[PDB]
UniProtKB/Swiss-Prot annotation:
It is an enzyme of class 2 (transferase). Keywords: Kinase, Transferase. It comes from the Bacteria. GO terms for biological process: D-galacturonate catabolic process; D-glucuronate catabolic process; DNA damage response. The gene is ydjH. Its EC number is 2.7.1.-. Belongs to the carbohydrate kinase PfkB family. GO terms for molecular function: 2-dehydro-3-deoxygluconokinase activity; carbohydrate kinase activity; protein homodimerization activity. This is Uncharacterized sugar kinase YdjH. The lineage of its organism: Bacteria, Pseudomonadati, Pseudomonadota, Gammaproteobacteria, Enterobacterales. GO terms for cellular component: cytosol. It comes from Escherichia coli (strain K12).
Length: 307
């Protein structure tokens, strides 16, 4: 039953919207609502993949506090295995405060000493790798301590157990470079970089050469989501384009990448071909964007096959 192991920081988000610098001009500024939600690429993937029908275990680091319990309760409700996810009394679970302006954009106030930054190789339960079929590193660069060297060790353990290795990415937090993770990337079977960010990291404009940079490090398959025209898939022996499902407006895009990866992964586990995986990924992403929040759209699976 355990199909996937998701490694990544599980955190809590608190969006303040709509706000602007003017909030500093009064003693008390009222909003229509202030609420906290579980967040983080890892938690989102574990949630969506579980809903799609595949048992998932989450490996992360959280504090022994209310935010941490909120995360554990979420996991319990979603049937996400948390045996490996332990609580650390010396740290505060990361609480990310989002400042969302009238334009819809947003900046963040974060805890530099939060759980997300403390996550490291000690939080990876290698003994459990033999229990799953696929490993998803939910965001290379997200937790700086999981650097190239740590990622290489993690992936070496994963491949020793024949696991499929999938990895997403975010923009480097400490000026890390592609060269610093090139070795670890040689172990990745499916890489899901984001177009914009991938452009910065590689310094290339075309999807093709951008993909080439990753293939150059040993990545087997590069799957680039191209918001609007589906996704661009590249390998050393082929290039494939699978247009996004047409007819979708979509209110919000946060978590789009997470739902995309979750759908692709669910498809992989079911043994579908690359085209079928891309279609499922695009379909899952399409449903997620129609609702507000990263995991509100995709409630089960019927909704996705419905497309």
């Amino acid at each position: 039953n355990l199909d996937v192991i998701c490694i990544g920081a599980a955190i809590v988000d608190i969006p303040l919207q709509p706000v602007s610098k003017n909030i500093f001009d009064v003693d008390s500024y009222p909003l229509e609502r202030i609420a906290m939600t579980t967040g983080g690429d890892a938690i989102n993937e574990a949630t969506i993949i579980s809903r799609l029908g595949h048992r998932t275990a989450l490996m992360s680091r959280i504090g022994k506090d209310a935010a941490g319990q909120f995360i554990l309760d979420h996991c319990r409700k979603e049937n996400i295995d948390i045996q490996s996810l332990k609580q650390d009394v010396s740290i505060d679970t990361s609480i990310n405060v989002g400042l969302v302006t009238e334009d819809g954009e947003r900046t963040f106030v974060t805890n530099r000493n939060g759980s997300l930054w403390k996550l490291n190789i000690d939080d990876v339960d290698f003994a459990r790798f033999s229990q799953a079929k696929l490993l998803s590193l939910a965001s290379i660069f997200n937790s700086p301590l999981l650097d190239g060297k740590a990622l290489t060790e993690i992936f070496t353990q994963a491949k020793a157990r024949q696991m499929i290795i999938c990895a997403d990415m975010i923009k480097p937090r400490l000026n890390e470079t592609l060269d610093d993770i090139c070795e670890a990337l040689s172990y990745v079977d499916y890489l899901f970089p984001n177009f914009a960010e991938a452009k910065l990291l590689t310094g290339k404009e075309t999807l093709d050469e951008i993909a080439d940079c990753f293939l150059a490090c040993g990545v087997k398959t590069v799957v680039i989501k191209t918001g609007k025209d589906g996704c661009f898939i590249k390998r050393g022996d082929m290039t494939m384009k699978v247009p996004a499902v047409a007819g979708i407006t979509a209110i919000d895009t946060i978590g789009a990448g997470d739902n995309f990866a979750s759908g692709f992964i669910a498809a992989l586990l079911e043994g579908k071909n690359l085209r079928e995986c891309a279609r499922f990924a695009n379909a899952t992403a399409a449903i997620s964007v129609l609702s507000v929040g990263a995991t509100t759209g995709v409630k089960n699976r019927k909704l996705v096959e419905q497309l």
